[PDB]
């Protein structure tokens, strides 16, 4: 498969910055695609196409020259509208199905006493959907349990740490309970006190 | 806008002077690839994706050309108003539970980047440049950028940042 990018519409010390983006919004697969291209000059978005509008629109006044221009020429406007299919739908149904949407890394769950408080470190998983719950002797613990936000490692993996305030009495068994789409059955790591 | 997934395709960014540019693809906040503009080569974040899909970097090159053009025209149109520098902020954390004698990866996270030109360099107060990987600039909803710098080392370290809108370099020790 091949990735296609949108076509940046062309126009007609002190530094200056220009940025373009092609945003595709998929809900329920391709059942509802929204496509928005953005033209940003010096961190201020000034022109924008939006599928919901169906034509270019100026966002600041400097956008009127280009919007009105890009709306006037059908070879451009029809192309940008059709990019909702030639870029968004094409990329989702094609290369993303083979890469991003097929990726499944299952997490690494280890428990360790921090000093008291246990830490269930859950690392190196994809995608982002994950459930982590503490049990003490087999009964779900929801008081004294604090989790970080979802931490994005950048290399297409996530990590989350879940700390439980507890007290080690010899005999107790604490278990970390992890649910993830990559796991056929949940992971259960035990820490016997 | 709400969605199950977001594909942010064809992120072209150009700045003058200096003639620095960047072309990237993104899915759900993660970098699929950037096109190296000097070697004219699609560089995938995960080589496996580079074995499962492909992208022609020449499209990145023509899009960069277009954005350079637009940067000229709009640079003139607004009577040459310059980019406004900004204050970037860093945050350091490890990829794995840190284990002495067992290596892993350390992560420095700079944000509120604008314009996209920083020296993300490191502090054993003394420069270390080896076994470091930087990512490319990621796009924020506010059109500033963030960038990660990974440092691999002996689980024995400050992340020094040199931006324009930072009066003096800001070191974020671990």
């Amino acid at each position, epitope marked *: 498969v091949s990735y296609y990018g949108p076509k940046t519409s*062309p126009v007609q010390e002190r530094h200056f910055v220009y940025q373009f983006m092609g945003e595709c919004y998929f809900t329920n697969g391709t059942q509802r695609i929204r496509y928005v291209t953005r033209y940003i000059y010096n961190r201020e978005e000034y022109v924008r196409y939006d599928s919901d509008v169906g034509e270019h629109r100026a966002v600041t006044e400097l956008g009127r020259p280009d919007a009105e221009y890009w709306n006037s020429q059908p070879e451009i406007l029809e192309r940008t509208r059709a990019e909702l299919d*030639t870029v968004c739908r094409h990329n989702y149904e094609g290369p993303e199905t083979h890469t991003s949407l097929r990726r499944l890394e299952q997490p690494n769950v280890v428990i360790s006493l921090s000093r008291n408080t246990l830490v269930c470190s859950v690392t190196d998983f994809y995608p982002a959907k994950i459930k982590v719950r503490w049990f003490r002797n087999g009964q779900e613990e929801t008081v004294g349990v604090s989790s970080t936000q979802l931490i994005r490692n950048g290399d297409w993996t996530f990590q989350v740490l879940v700390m439980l305030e507890m007290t080690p009495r010899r005999g107790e068994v604490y278990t970390c309970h992890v649910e993830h789409p990559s796991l056929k059955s949940p992971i259960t790591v035990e820490w016997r006190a | 806008i709400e969605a199950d997934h977001v594909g942010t395709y064809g992120i072209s960014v150009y700045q003058s002077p200096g003639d620095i540019g960047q072309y990237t693809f993104e899915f759900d906040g993660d970098e699929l690839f950037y096109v190296d503009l000097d070697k004219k080569e699609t560089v995938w974040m995960l080589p496996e994706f580079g074995q499962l899909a492909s992208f022609d970097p*020449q*499209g990145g090159l023509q899009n960069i050309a277009v954005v350079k053009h637009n940067l000229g025209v709009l640079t003139k149109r607004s009577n040459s108003t310059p980019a406004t520098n900004e204050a970037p902020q860093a945050t350091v954390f490890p990829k794995s539970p840190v284990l002495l004698g067992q290596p892993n990866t350390l992560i420095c996270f700079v944000d509120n980047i604008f314009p996209p030109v920083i020296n993300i360099t490191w502090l054993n107060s003394k420069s270390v440049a080896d076994g470091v990987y930087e990512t490319s600039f990621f796009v924020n909803r506010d059109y500033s950028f963030h960038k990660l710098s990974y440092l691999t080392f002996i689980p024995s370290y400050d992340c020094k940042v040199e931006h324009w809108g930072l009066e003096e370099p800001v070191l974020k020790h671990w």
Partner: T-cell receptor
Amino acid sequence: AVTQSPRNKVAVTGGKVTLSCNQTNNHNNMYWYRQDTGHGLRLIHYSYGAGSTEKGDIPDGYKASRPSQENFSLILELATPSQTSVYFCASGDFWGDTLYFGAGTRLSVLE
Amino acid sequence: QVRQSPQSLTVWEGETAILNCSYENSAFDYLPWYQQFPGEGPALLIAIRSVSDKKEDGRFTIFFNKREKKLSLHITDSQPGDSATYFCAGIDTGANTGKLTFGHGTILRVHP
């Protein structure tokens, strides 16, 4: 208009030839082609803008130079009989449906 | 690779010349025909998009067939002024690259 220069040229092997192309369409893309019986038109080098040159399908033997938006030049440092051909320069807009060719240059490289 | 047939075609005035073209890449979505007069450089004659099964331009017509990836140019009421080399080209416009892939051309000689 897209005009080339020179339009005819005879050279000896091992000499340096410089075909040179000028365009006044305010186009951004510029291409260098050669035409030969049994091979059609073949891309040698092209360019998306000033300062950049991209390799075509048959770039060996030639270097390209785009010093400005209206000038695209093709250079043979060690001219060779196999480089005897008819060369055509083209221009095009960004995402353009049309290439605009020049009139051509006939070049012979002789032992 | 684009493949054109026949390599030479000779026609009498008023006949209908048919230049045939076939390509391999399924991703080609834009196919233009360039006309080259002797001593000149080629110029865009007529082009069709993959989404259309045709293109009418006066006496020149493009019949496109996407399933077979086959292409054909019909020149009706051929005039001796149509004697020229015709090239079939194809590009995947989605790749944003701007390289047409040219065929080898058919030399059309129209007898007066």
